[PDB]
Design a protein around this ligand. Structure first.
Ligand SMILES: COC(=O)c1cccc(NS(C)(=O)=O)c1
Length: 281
């Protein structure tokens, strides 16, 4: 059981060592399409690339590339699209992917500005009356409503296909309080946020996979998916303590490189799941 394994690693301070064994054991697959010169300006970090095998393809004939990965957790019956914070020139692509994958929810785990730099383009409207048109992808986006709370904001948006006049309602879940450095002291607000996404039905198989991002779509995004999948497997299994968070992380890393960027994020994920197990036990 992980609670005991938690104290063990913690008491021994072996987090950096566990973390290194995961780095070593992690899968490595081609990312040939990411590295093509015509895609250079579609990537935010040159060292954060989708594997070819699990990359999301845009349905435009021109260039089908977006820095986005489908993570399929077969046993948990859960899929996630992990992507980078959109660039000024990829906001249109981002909303096209959301449209084409029939996603209900977008989960955002960064602020637009952190440490005095831009981590992300402003890809959603700030006022009801000021909608955004994406000329390249023929999509209109409108803010319908916005519910600002202490730790997070939920924003009801209408995505309209200008080509076909279909509209869909998208939910934007924005965790607004992840600190600039390290990880939250308590996982309580993060778990509350995860349960709010769950309740929305955005994680449900009725819908396309949820789109999850931070700046790179591997660190905070990783923690989100890892916690969701682990808690869900603990419901599904005859023996809940058979769930190995290191095994689960390694399965997710077959789909996108670098999920969980630091030993700090690894520790926080353990804490979140343990506290998660507790809330629902
Ligand atoms: C901003 O409006 C909302 O909060 C909203 C709108 C529509 C649906 C939901 N589902 S929920 C209460 O689980 O998050 C929320």
């Amino acid at each position: 059981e992980m609670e005991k394994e938690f104290e063990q690693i913690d008491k021994s301070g072996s987090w950096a060592a566990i973390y290194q064994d995961i780095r070593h054991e992690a899968s490595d697959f081609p990312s040939r399409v990411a590295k093509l010169p015509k895609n250079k300006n579609r990537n935010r970090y040159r060292d954060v690339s989708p594997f070819d095998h699990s990359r999301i393809k845009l349905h435009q004939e021109d260039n089908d590339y977006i820095n986005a990965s489908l993570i399929k957790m077969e046993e948990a019956q859960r899929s996630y699209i992990l992507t980078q914070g959109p660039l000024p020139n990829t906001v249109g692509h981002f909303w096209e992917m959301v449209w084409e994958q029939k996603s209900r929810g977008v989960v955002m785990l960064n602020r637009v500005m952190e440490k005095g730099s831009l981590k992300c383009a402003q890809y959603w409207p700030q006022k009801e009356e000021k909608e955004m048109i994406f000329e390249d992808t023929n999509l209109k986006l409108t803010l319908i409503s916005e519910d600002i709370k202490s730790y997070y904001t939920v924003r009801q948006l209408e995505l309209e296909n200008l080509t076909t006049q279909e509209t869909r309602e998208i939910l934007h879940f924005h965790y607004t309080t992840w600190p600039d450095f390290g990880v939250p002291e308590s996982p309580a607000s993060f778990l509350n946020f995860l349960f709010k996404v769950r309740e929305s039905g955005s994680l449900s198989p009725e819908h396309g996979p949820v789109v999850v991002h931070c700046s790179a779509g591997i660190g905070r995004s990783g923690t989100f998916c890892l916690a969701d999948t682990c808690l869900l497997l603990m419901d599904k299994r005859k023996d809940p303590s058979s769930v190995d968070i290191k095994k689960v992380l390694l399965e997710m890393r077959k789909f996108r490189m670098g999920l969980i960027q630091t030993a700090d994020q690894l520790r926080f994920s353990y804490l979140a799941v343990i506290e998660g197990a507790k809330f629902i036990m």
